[PDB]
Amino acid sequence: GSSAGFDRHITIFSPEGRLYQVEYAFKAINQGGLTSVAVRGKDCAVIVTQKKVPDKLLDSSTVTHLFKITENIGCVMTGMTADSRSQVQRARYEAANWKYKYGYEIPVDMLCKRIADISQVYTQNAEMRPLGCCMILIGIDEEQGPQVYKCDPAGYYCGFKATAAGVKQTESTSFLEKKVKKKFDWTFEQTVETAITCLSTVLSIDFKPSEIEVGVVTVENPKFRILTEAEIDAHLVALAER
Amino acid sequence: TGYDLSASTFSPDGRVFQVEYAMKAVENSSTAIGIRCKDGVVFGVEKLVLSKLYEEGSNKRLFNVDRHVGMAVAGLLADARSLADIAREEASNFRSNFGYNIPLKHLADRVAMYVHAYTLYSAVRPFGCSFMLGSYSVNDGAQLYMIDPSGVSYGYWGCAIGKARQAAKTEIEKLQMKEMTCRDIVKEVAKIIYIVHDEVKDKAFELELSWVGELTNGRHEIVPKDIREEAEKYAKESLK
Amino acid sequence: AKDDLSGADIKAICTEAGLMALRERRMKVTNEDFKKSKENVLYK
Amino acid sequence: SRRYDSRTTIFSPEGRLYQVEYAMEAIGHAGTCLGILANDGVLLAAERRNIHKLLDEVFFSEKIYKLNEDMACSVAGITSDANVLTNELRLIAIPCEQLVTALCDIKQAYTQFGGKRPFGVSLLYIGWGFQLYQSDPSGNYGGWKATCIGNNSAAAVSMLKQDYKEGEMTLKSALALAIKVLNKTMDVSKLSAEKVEIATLTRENGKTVIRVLKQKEVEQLIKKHEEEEAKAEREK
Amino acid sequence: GYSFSLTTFSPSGKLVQIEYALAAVAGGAPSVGIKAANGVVLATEKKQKSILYDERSVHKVEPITKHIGLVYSGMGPDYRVLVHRARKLAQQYYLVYQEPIPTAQLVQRVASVMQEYTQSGGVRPFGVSLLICGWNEGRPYLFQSDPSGAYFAWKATAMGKNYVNGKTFLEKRYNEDLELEDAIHTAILTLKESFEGQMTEDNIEVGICNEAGFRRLTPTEVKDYLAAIA
Amino acid sequence: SYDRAITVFSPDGHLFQVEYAQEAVKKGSTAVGVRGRDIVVLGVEKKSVAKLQDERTVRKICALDDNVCMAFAGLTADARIVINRARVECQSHRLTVEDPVTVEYITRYIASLKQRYTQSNGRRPFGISALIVGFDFDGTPRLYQTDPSGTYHAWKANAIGRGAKSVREFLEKNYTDEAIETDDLTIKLVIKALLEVVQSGGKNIELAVMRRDQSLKILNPEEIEKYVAEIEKEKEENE
Amino acid sequence: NQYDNDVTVWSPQGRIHQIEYAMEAVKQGSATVGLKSKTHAVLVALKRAQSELAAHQKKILHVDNHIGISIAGLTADARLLCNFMRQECLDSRFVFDRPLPVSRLVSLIGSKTQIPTQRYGRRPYGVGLLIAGYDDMGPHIFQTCPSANYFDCRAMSIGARSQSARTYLERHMSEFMECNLNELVKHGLRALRETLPAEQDLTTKNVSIGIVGKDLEFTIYDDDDVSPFLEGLEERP
Amino acid sequence: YDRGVNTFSPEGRLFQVEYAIEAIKLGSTAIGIQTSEGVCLAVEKRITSPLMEPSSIEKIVEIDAHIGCAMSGLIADAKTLIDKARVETQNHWFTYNETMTVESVTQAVSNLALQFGEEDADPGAMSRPFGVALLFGGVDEKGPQLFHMDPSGTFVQCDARAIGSASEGAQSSLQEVYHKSMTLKEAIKSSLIILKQVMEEKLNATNIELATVQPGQNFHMFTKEELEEVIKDI
């Protein structure tokens, strides 16, 4: 962990080849205290995150980390709330610009690849800080099917069958790793159930249908929709009864 | 230590301290509360007079960023004023492009992104003011959004910004705001501000009241003096 | 010998020149000894 | 902004430009580049530091670059910065000194305004009369009859100061001087043809011929020098 | 943005920031390139920390043209910036000359971009090394572009973690008469010494260039090559 | 655009970058200029004359115009920018006024250009001092000196470089109407001045003379060697 | 410290020291008193001379026919602000052909002076202004701070030793509203007298008065023209 | 250093402005006296070598035929200020066909001070204050007028102001010798007595500069013969 000069204050290399400022942006994902989980099934993709409303004074309808980037693409934001909105607005602009310039809906892989490209410039130029947020896109592709892509502060991005970002990312990764090892092409109900279970088992909350937001995309309806409290209750009831 | 002198520098714990220091400027200002009732939003600002030499109306913390949106501020007043014109120019551009009054959710999201844009680079400093935007319309309904120096905008039923924000929030919680109207709430907003005011500490405050609702036809305006004085008497009586 | 010549370099040339003469079992220092002296202290 | 500014283009309290000197220190750790002017031609002898056995040989030359039909240059220092200067040297092209002055104006500009680090490259220029030039990161250029830049440049100049017969030098004598100077400068006692890079500029038929000597030709010079040095051993 | 260079000369005459960028290259996943008689092979260790990652989603061996391919060792995001620049530079070459860009030209153009971030204001050097492979004039080409902007023509080289040992492994295992298939075998063997765990068809990425052009070997093809190792 | 204040006031009120630029002047070759009756003599000491160095390229005396020439002391690369900028202005002045530039004008332009670099963002001061000599249209010999600060003064005789103080002290004692009665005596004066700091002798002296209605004439080493013999000869009879 | 070198550096206490340091520039300036009545708003300034062979520095500047200001701080910065407010007042005449409202003009200079207090490398306008004006809404006295925060004051005093004047202004505040023009100026002169040392007194050389009223244009009074105002007020106890 | 050019001290002082004021104290002494019969401007040339031509040291400049300036501090810096004063004048004449008032000339030059900064500035913007103090003296509608400018942009009318290394001593001497109703010839003499007492060298007609702007008459630099006439007294 050697240091030499301003390698801790601006995005320049350390003596061992480390960008500490970029690493510090990763710790900002845990500043919000929320965990997001995304699971991809055979014909659906689900993003689930916990919602916290500390007081009844706050309008719970406005606390949403699930954002409809496009009619067919939705994302869950974890990290700094202010930086998360900036990425969502940028992602919406790029999705709209892609449709205008190219004539077809932006692929999920290309949407974060641009966002990862946008966030990489922050990791090379020293005049701006990396956005302390993590973006997980889900969407149904025309051919590749369901897609899940995480989009880190450093510009790293990858496809995921089941990913998670936030405070409990590593504990939820192990749970999802265990489930995917079983090699089951989950249906829509199983994928929501394993998404809710992963957040529930790691946080140990036994969710009510007001503490988690669930957003799904399915092959039959390739549109991003926010599950209503009643709809989330159906999965919570089904999970409990088994 | 050098980790808190720029907004483009993250702390090793992943926290931008320059933004957090701007949060402290808001917590050093007087308390402004806003309550979203059944048929509108009512704003109340505890406006201390720093001297008797100031005229009644100086340092107005209640702005009109649009004909249907108000703004209650706390923190650096110069930054609060600057963010007022940004909201005014955002609302003006929205009407000049799309042809209708700017939704408060979009107005809050647009100004907050301007606030957030000053939290990323060392060439600018974060705005040292937190403000609440309240609006009412027949279609969208009463909305109350609060934007902080970091750039975070959440909707609220009742919010407080200032040094007695915690104390005022407890008083707001006792209210049944979702059922009572603006007429019943202006008295309550007056009562809460008087409760949280510290007479032994900085004293001689002025009650600044404003509202937007169906009784103003979706237009933000200062509460008329007759109703404002009536609420003031009720607020003073509640202190026994 | 060099533009930025110091007294230490001047003395080092001499003692090395004498050391070169000592190697060849000589008491008289020749110009070749000084030539090989400069290439030892100033260079390499 | 001011905190992270290293202030490259400022004066030291003693009146020097530290970035310029620190750049000149980089050339000292770079490959040895030789240049000797003769009456019928001028040569650039460059030490090759990319002497790994797995390094493919595809380019015409490694450190010696052709600027135009009449001029050639060899670089010592940061190779990436050299590529920038060689491209701009070609774009500027022309008389030899005019080309050298034009690039040194670019190099001096980075040491006066802009806040950027200087180009850590020293160049030896050869062209057609016959003339040899040397440039420094400070933007200071000078014409030479025989000069060296890079590792053991001072040692190489010292032997040139003694063995370079002014006016009475041909290509064969100058080429022989290049091998002899490079022998002491390089730490290798043999100086194989794979670690040395020689290019000659000569006027044939009223046209300038810039040619990089093949490995077979160079081995002859290394051989001829070693027997000649062995001949001097016969005297003692 | 900042208008002052973040890379400066140390008192010892070294661009210290460039050396630190090369330290990031030495920490990247190993990348091996071999120029055989009839082609060039590019191989890398595309190993994920969990199965949840989709291996085929992001590729480390990315084509630039129909005949030029890239493999890196260093920072993943920085490689994509250079991939886009290489493709843009390859196109800008193609519109003017109406001819596929030569391999040596693209490396020079790409290495110039890398040098800029070592001199430009307010930017840090790219923390990757690029192994450029191509086919022009009926001859295979292999180049390496360091973070400083220096480009080297390699008959066979290894980058990334344990690159020093991999380079010596190639010295004793590479000959100019080697064929492309034996190059792939030698490339996988070069990766194997630095590899930890077992090499499946998904945790390594192999790309080859020949007269037919550059293509990235599918995981099925790499499985056949891998079977010959054991 | 690099927009930063390099030259700023010290708390005492000094511009330290200007002083440091004047410190680089003190590390350069000694340049000596003497304003005679009908001749102007510029003398520059040569640093470590190398038998392998082309003396034509490293020349500290350059002609801005046909009637104005200058010798510098300091950073060689810095000077070449000033000479080229001054040369372009000499032709611009001649294009507009249709009259050859005066020595006062081009020493004013160089000084103004030098001063601009002590008050402009991102630019370090020029680390050279200029000894501008020449003739006006009316035949009056003029000698001017600039420093990195931007101050230009006219001198009967002056020296810049490392040994400026010693040569100037020598010049204040030996510059008299008798010493500039003839051109030969004026040329001897600069050599006498430069012999005070040049240790080896005339091999490290570069001499350039300009006469009225004539171009700049660089003195060949044989001509200089002829003069040093005369000074050496005149030394004996004075003993 | 490390939190006082730039205007974009927040102190850990939520304060900007460069803004605060610029606020001290006003406190180094000479005292000026601004008070208003039902129909008039006059400015009283105490001019300072570096040496007795030099003129006393002008403090009241004419911005428009209906708006006038008194400066306290950096004179060149005051000129920069006054030139901006002179142009804005002139611009309003060119477009709307009406006097620029005083409250509306101070808002422009409050937004103009806030920009330098938030960008890197810029500095706050180290000048304090006391704006006196008349419009459709009546007389106004505005105080402008280097912090870009302006106050609508009924009677204000800024400068060196201005707090003594504020004490006088607070005490006799109630009688400002209904007193005539002569009594209003004497109140300001009496207020400005509290800033002086004991041995010093208000003279024609060090007093400048600027008056704007309902039917009276903004006129600045000087040494000859201030004597009709000084002679009435009695000697201080 | 860490501090920028536009940085405020804890006492409200612009650091660079205060530093530029200290630069005047290293400059040559200049004495300016305003009289009913005209304005007087004197400055010491401060010759450092007999080989330096005294005439080349121009520390009093013709701003216009009716106004001149005496400079002290960094002489190279005042050239930029003098040039605009010679440009702003002849711009007033171009637009209004009249000679610009001495106060307005000093006002225009004063605006250049504080037009310096690091960031958010034009490419031609300055980086540091003008480390020079100017003594404008001329004749206009208001008669003879003397104005003093400092690197802070602060200009003020002065009856008799002394700037330079000996500003403190000469100003004290000026106060003891200046009365409002005195002739210009007395002003020329009185300024020369004070200069001779503060100069390092012995006062003569070659190491000083005298200029006068009388009403009616134009700006007039004193020649060697004219200076020797008043030097011969004291």
PDB file of C-alpha atoms in Angstrom, chain B residues 60-240:
ATOM      1  CA  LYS B  60     -36.803  36.164   2.185  1.00  0.00           C
ATOM      2  CA  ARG B  61     -36.190  32.417   2.457  1.00  0.00           C
ATOM      3  CA  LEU B  62     -39.447  31.728   0.572  1.00  0.00           C
ATOM      4  CA  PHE B  63     -39.112  32.086  -3.199  1.00  0.00           C
ATOM      5  CA  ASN B  64     -41.427  31.650  -6.184  1.00  0.00           C
ATOM      6  CA  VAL B  65     -39.480  29.640  -8.765  1.00  0.00           C
ATOM      7  CA  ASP B  66     -42.659  29.352 -10.853  1.00  0.00           C
ATOM      8  CA  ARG B  67     -46.268  30.483 -10.749  1.00  0.00           C
ATOM      9  CA  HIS B  68     -47.146  27.090  -9.234  1.00  0.00           C
ATOM     10  CA  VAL B  69     -43.940  26.127  -7.369  1.00  0.00           C
ATOM     11  CA  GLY B  70     -42.548  27.606  -4.171  1.00  0.00           C
ATOM     12  CA  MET B  71     -39.139  27.262  -2.566  1.00  0.00           C
ATOM     13  CA  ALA B  72     -38.126  27.287   1.101  1.00  0.00           C
ATOM     14  CA  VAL B  73     -34.372  27.497   1.604  1.00  0.00           C
ATOM     15  CA  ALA B  74     -31.847  26.946   4.378  1.00  0.00           C
ATOM     16  CA  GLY B  75     -28.087  27.512   4.472  1.00  0.00           C
ATOM     17  CA  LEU B  76     -26.058  29.983   2.436  1.00  0.00           C
ATOM     18  CA  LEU B  77     -28.588  32.565   1.268  1.00  0.00           C
ATOM     19  CA  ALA B  78     -26.481  33.601  -1.735  1.00  0.00           C
ATOM     20  CA  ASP B  79     -26.359  29.978  -2.889  1.00  0.00           C
ATOM     21  CA  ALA B  80     -30.059  29.677  -2.048  1.00  0.00           C
ATOM     22  CA  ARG B  81     -30.788  32.662  -4.282  1.00  0.00           C
ATOM     23  CA  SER B  82     -28.581  31.279  -7.061  1.00  0.00           C
ATOM     24  CA  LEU B  83     -30.413  27.948  -6.933  1.00  0.00           C
ATOM     25  CA  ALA B  84     -33.668  29.911  -7.059  1.00  0.00           C
ATOM     26  CA  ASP B  85     -32.797  31.439 -10.438  1.00  0.00           C
ATOM     27  CA  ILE B  86     -31.635  28.029 -11.680  1.00  0.00           C
ATOM     28  CA  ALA B  87     -35.077  26.709 -10.767  1.00  0.00           C
ATOM     29  CA  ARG B  88     -36.674  29.799 -12.327  1.00  0.00           C
ATOM     30  CA  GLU B  89     -34.705  29.380 -15.551  1.00  0.00           C
ATOM     31  CA  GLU B  90     -35.404  25.639 -15.565  1.00  0.00           C
ATOM     32  CA  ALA B  91     -39.144  26.253 -15.193  1.00  0.00           C
ATOM     33  CA  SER B  92     -39.035  29.012 -17.814  1.00  0.00           C
ATOM     34  CA  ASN B  93     -37.237  26.790 -20.327  1.00  0.00           C
ATOM     35  CA  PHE B  94     -39.642  23.901 -19.701  1.00  0.00           C
ATOM     36  CA  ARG B  95     -42.632  26.086 -20.568  1.00  0.00           C
ATOM     37  CA  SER B  96     -40.834  27.545 -23.592  1.00  0.00           C
ATOM     38  CA  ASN B  97     -40.166  24.053 -25.005  1.00  0.00           C
ATOM     39  CA  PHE B  98     -42.977  21.703 -23.967  1.00  0.00           C
ATOM     40  CA  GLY B  99     -45.766  24.238 -23.495  1.00  0.00           C
ATOM     41  CA  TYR B 100     -47.026  23.427 -19.998  1.00  0.00           C
ATOM     42  CA  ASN B 101     -46.131  24.056 -16.375  1.00  0.00           C
ATOM     43  CA  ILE B 102     -43.107  22.065 -15.244  1.00  0.00           C
ATOM     44  CA  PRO B 103     -43.975  19.026 -13.097  1.00  0.00           C
ATOM     45  CA  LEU B 104     -42.513  19.413  -9.632  1.00  0.00           C
ATOM     46  CA  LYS B 105     -40.966  15.944  -9.816  1.00  0.00           C
ATOM     47  CA  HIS B 106     -39.126  16.985 -12.978  1.00  0.00           C
ATOM     48  CA  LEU B 107     -38.299  20.433 -11.592  1.00  0.00           C
ATOM     49  CA  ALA B 108     -36.818  18.807  -8.493  1.00  0.00           C
ATOM     50  CA  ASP B 109     -34.919  16.287 -10.619  1.00  0.00           C
ATOM     51  CA  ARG B 110     -33.574  19.016 -12.924  1.00  0.00           C
ATOM     52  CA  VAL B 111     -32.379  21.408 -10.204  1.00  0.00           C
ATOM     53  CA  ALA B 112     -30.934  18.565  -8.122  1.00  0.00           C
ATOM     54  CA  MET B 113     -28.800  17.477 -11.080  1.00  0.00           C
ATOM     55  CA  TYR B 114     -27.508  21.045 -11.307  1.00  0.00           C
ATOM     56  CA  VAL B 115     -26.733  20.832  -7.582  1.00  0.00           C
ATOM     57  CA  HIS B 116     -25.092  17.431  -8.054  1.00  0.00           C
ATOM     58  CA  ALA B 117     -22.963  18.760 -10.921  1.00  0.00           C
ATOM     59  CA  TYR B 118     -21.151  21.030  -8.441  1.00  0.00           C
ATOM     60  CA  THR B 119     -20.257  18.043  -6.225  1.00  0.00           C
ATOM     61  CA  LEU B 120     -17.876  16.321  -8.665  1.00  0.00           C
ATOM     62  CA  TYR B 121     -15.137  18.777  -9.692  1.00  0.00           C
ATOM     63  CA  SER B 122     -12.557  20.825  -7.812  1.00  0.00           C
ATOM     64  CA  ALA B 123     -13.273  23.794 -10.101  1.00  0.00           C
ATOM     65  CA  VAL B 124     -16.569  24.452  -8.281  1.00  0.00           C
ATOM     66  CA  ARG B 125     -17.819  24.051  -4.745  1.00  0.00           C
ATOM     67  CA  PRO B 126     -21.021  22.316  -3.605  1.00  0.00           C
ATOM     68  CA  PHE B 127     -23.935  24.639  -2.968  1.00  0.00           C
ATOM     69  CA  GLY B 128     -24.245  25.395   0.725  1.00  0.00           C
ATOM     70  CA  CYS B 129     -28.035  25.460   0.776  1.00  0.00           C
ATOM     71  CA  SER B 130     -30.797  22.886   1.115  1.00  0.00           C
ATOM     72  CA  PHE B 131     -34.213  23.820  -0.236  1.00  0.00           C
ATOM     73  CA  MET B 132     -37.739  22.440  -0.535  1.00  0.00           C
ATOM     74  CA  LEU B 133     -39.919  22.814  -3.629  1.00  0.00           C
ATOM     75  CA  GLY B 134     -43.672  22.552  -3.149  1.00  0.00           C
ATOM     76  CA  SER B 135     -46.354  22.590  -5.812  1.00  0.00           C
ATOM     77  CA  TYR B 136     -50.018  21.743  -6.296  1.00  0.00           C
ATOM     78  CA  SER B 137     -52.071  20.972  -9.385  1.00  0.00           C
ATOM     79  CA  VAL B 138     -55.429  19.384 -10.127  1.00  0.00           C
ATOM     80  CA  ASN B 139     -53.782  16.497 -11.988  1.00  0.00           C
ATOM     81  CA  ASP B 140     -50.467  15.845 -10.235  1.00  0.00           C
ATOM     82  CA  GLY B 141     -51.672  16.784  -6.750  1.00  0.00           C
ATOM     83  CA  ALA B 142     -49.786  18.288  -3.851  1.00  0.00           C
ATOM     84  CA  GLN B 143     -46.085  17.446  -4.013  1.00  0.00           C
ATOM     85  CA  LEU B 144     -43.226  18.367  -1.690  1.00  0.00           C
ATOM     86  CA  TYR B 145     -39.622  17.663  -2.681  1.00  0.00           C
ATOM     87  CA  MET B 146     -36.492  18.540  -0.707  1.00  0.00           C
ATOM     88  CA  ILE B 147     -33.096  18.819  -2.411  1.00  0.00           C
ATOM     89  CA  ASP B 148     -29.876  18.696  -0.388  1.00  0.00           C
ATOM     90  CA  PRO B 149     -26.387  19.998  -1.250  1.00  0.00           C
ATOM     91  CA  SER B 150     -25.286  16.516  -2.331  1.00  0.00           C
ATOM     92  CA  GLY B 151     -27.988  16.529  -4.997  1.00  0.00           C
ATOM     93  CA  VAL B 152     -30.448  14.109  -3.383  1.00  0.00           C
ATOM     94  CA  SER B 153     -34.146  14.776  -4.002  1.00  0.00           C
ATOM     95  CA  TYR B 154     -36.862  12.819  -2.196  1.00  0.00           C
ATOM     96  CA  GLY B 155     -40.572  13.454  -1.963  1.00  0.00           C
ATOM     97  CA  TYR B 156     -41.931  14.286   1.464  1.00  0.00           C
ATOM     98  CA  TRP B 157     -45.147  14.558   3.436  1.00  0.00           C
ATOM     99  CA  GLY B 158     -43.446  16.833   5.956  1.00  0.00           C
ATOM    100  CA  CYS B 159     -39.836  18.001   5.956  1.00  0.00           C
ATOM    101  CA  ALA B 160     -37.577  20.271   7.981  1.00  0.00           C
ATOM    102  CA  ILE B 161     -34.289  21.883   6.967  1.00  0.00           C
ATOM    103  CA  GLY B 162     -32.169  23.800   9.449  1.00  0.00           C
ATOM    104  CA  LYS B 163     -30.681  23.390  12.898  1.00  0.00           C
ATOM    105  CA  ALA B 164     -33.966  22.306  14.525  1.00  0.00           C
ATOM    106  CA  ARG B 165     -34.736  19.844  11.728  1.00  0.00           C
ATOM    107  CA  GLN B 166     -34.724  16.882  14.121  1.00  0.00           C
ATOM    108  CA  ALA B 167     -36.921  18.676  16.660  1.00  0.00           C
ATOM    109  CA  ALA B 168     -39.333  19.891  13.980  1.00  0.00           C
ATOM    110  CA  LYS B 169     -39.620  16.428  12.427  1.00  0.00           C
ATOM    111  CA  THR B 170     -40.911  15.037  15.725  1.00  0.00           C
ATOM    112  CA  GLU B 171     -43.550  17.778  15.793  1.00  0.00           C
ATOM    113  CA  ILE B 172     -44.529  17.140  12.164  1.00  0.00           C
ATOM    114  CA  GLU B 173     -45.005  13.426  12.881  1.00  0.00           C
ATOM    115  CA  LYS B 174     -47.751  14.169  15.422  1.00  0.00           C
ATOM    116  CA  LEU B 175     -49.779  15.724  12.594  1.00  0.00           C
ATOM    117  CA  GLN B 176     -52.304  13.846  10.475  1.00  0.00           C
ATOM    118  CA  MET B 177     -51.291  15.785   7.385  1.00  0.00           C
ATOM    119  CA  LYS B 178     -52.846  13.392   4.863  1.00  0.00           C
ATOM    120  CA  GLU B 179     -56.352  14.224   6.153  1.00  0.00           C
ATOM    121  CA  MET B 180     -56.235  17.888   7.206  1.00  0.00           C
ATOM    122  CA  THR B 181     -56.255  20.840   4.815  1.00  0.00           C
ATOM    123  CA  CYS B 182     -54.025  23.866   4.257  1.00  0.00           C
ATOM    124  CA  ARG B 183     -56.226  26.060   6.465  1.00  0.00           C
ATOM    125  CA  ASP B 184     -55.732  23.687   9.396  1.00  0.00           C
ATOM    126  CA  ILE B 185     -52.046  23.177   8.594  1.00  0.00           C
ATOM    127  CA  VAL B 186     -50.923  26.824   8.459  1.00  0.00           C
ATOM    128  CA  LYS B 187     -51.756  26.992  12.158  1.00  0.00           C
ATOM    129  CA  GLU B 188     -49.786  23.773  12.679  1.00  0.00           C
ATOM    130  CA  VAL B 189     -46.776  24.992  10.671  1.00  0.00           C
ATOM    131  CA  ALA B 190     -46.834  28.128  12.821  1.00  0.00           C
ATOM    132  CA  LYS B 191     -47.051  26.009  15.979  1.00  0.00           C
ATOM    133  CA  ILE B 192     -44.133  23.762  15.005  1.00  0.00           C
ATOM    134  CA  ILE B 193     -41.846  26.679  14.131  1.00  0.00           C
ATOM    135  CA  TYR B 194     -42.643  28.389  17.438  1.00  0.00           C
ATOM    136  CA  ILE B 195     -42.022  25.137  19.335  1.00  0.00           C
ATOM    137  CA  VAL B 196     -38.577  24.602  17.792  1.00  0.00           C
ATOM    138  CA  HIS B 197     -37.481  28.235  18.111  1.00  0.00           C
ATOM    139  CA  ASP B 198     -34.982  28.890  20.910  1.00  0.00           C
ATOM    140  CA  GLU B 199     -35.744  32.148  22.712  1.00  0.00           C
ATOM    141  CA  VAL B 200     -32.720  31.964  25.026  1.00  0.00           C
ATOM    142  CA  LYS B 201     -30.568  31.307  21.942  1.00  0.00           C
ATOM    143  CA  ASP B 202     -30.836  33.423  18.762  1.00  0.00           C
ATOM    144  CA  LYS B 203     -34.212  35.123  19.116  1.00  0.00           C
ATOM    145  CA  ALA B 204     -36.543  37.686  17.512  1.00  0.00           C
ATOM    146  CA  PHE B 205     -37.673  35.612  14.548  1.00  0.00           C
ATOM    147  CA  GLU B 206     -40.258  36.410  11.882  1.00  0.00           C
ATOM    148  CA  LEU B 207     -42.831  33.852  10.747  1.00  0.00           C
ATOM    149  CA  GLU B 208     -42.635  33.564   6.957  1.00  0.00           C
ATOM    150  CA  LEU B 209     -45.580  31.575   5.602  1.00  0.00           C
ATOM    151  CA  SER B 210     -46.417  30.497   2.061  1.00  0.00           C
ATOM    152  CA  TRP B 211     -48.678  27.923   0.457  1.00  0.00           C
ATOM    153  CA  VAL B 212     -49.823  26.390  -2.817  1.00  0.00           C
ATOM    154  CA  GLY B 213     -53.055  24.448  -3.086  1.00  0.00           C
ATOM    155  CA  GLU B 214     -56.576  24.263  -4.421  1.00  0.00           C
ATOM    156  CA  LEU B 215     -57.478  27.338  -2.360  1.00  0.00           C
ATOM    157  CA  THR B 216     -54.929  29.356  -4.373  1.00  0.00           C
ATOM    158  CA  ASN B 217     -55.896  27.671  -7.678  1.00  0.00           C
ATOM    159  CA  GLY B 218     -52.514  25.957  -7.877  1.00  0.00           C
ATOM    160  CA  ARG B 219     -50.566  29.188  -7.347  1.00  0.00           C
ATOM    161  CA  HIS B 220     -47.797  29.633  -4.787  1.00  0.00           C
ATOM    162  CA  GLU B 221     -48.286  32.758  -2.688  1.00  0.00           C
ATOM    163  CA  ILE B 222     -47.442  34.211   0.699  1.00  0.00           C
ATOM    164  CA  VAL B 223     -50.109  33.406   3.276  1.00  0.00           C
ATOM    165  CA  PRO B 224     -52.204  36.584   3.688  1.00  0.00           C
ATOM    166  CA  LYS B 225     -51.436  38.653   6.765  1.00  0.00           C
ATOM    167  CA  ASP B 226     -54.887  38.048   8.257  1.00  0.00           C
ATOM    168  CA  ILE B 227     -54.448  34.263   8.229  1.00  0.00           C
ATOM    169  CA  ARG B 228     -50.763  34.568   9.137  1.00  0.00           C
ATOM    170  CA  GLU B 229     -51.547  36.625  12.245  1.00  0.00           C
ATOM    171  CA  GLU B 230     -54.362  34.231  13.175  1.00  0.00           C
ATOM    172  CA  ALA B 231     -51.933  31.304  13.053  1.00  0.00           C
ATOM    173  CA  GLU B 232     -49.371  33.329  15.015  1.00  0.00           C
ATOM    174  CA  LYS B 233     -51.850  33.869  17.855  1.00  0.00           C
ATOM    175  CA  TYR B 234     -52.658  30.149  17.856  1.00  0.00           C
ATOM    176  CA  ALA B 235     -48.952  29.276  17.820  1.00  0.00           C
ATOM    177  CA  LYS B 236     -48.219  31.668  20.690  1.00  0.00           C
ATOM    178  CA  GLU B 237     -51.187  30.297  22.643  1.00  0.00           C
ATOM    179  CA  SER B 238     -49.924  26.723  22.225  1.00  0.00           C
ATOM    180  CA  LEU B 239     -46.838  27.692  24.255  1.00  0.00           C
ATOM    181  CA  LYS B 240     -49.063  28.514  27.268  1.00  0.00           C
TER     182      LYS B 240
END
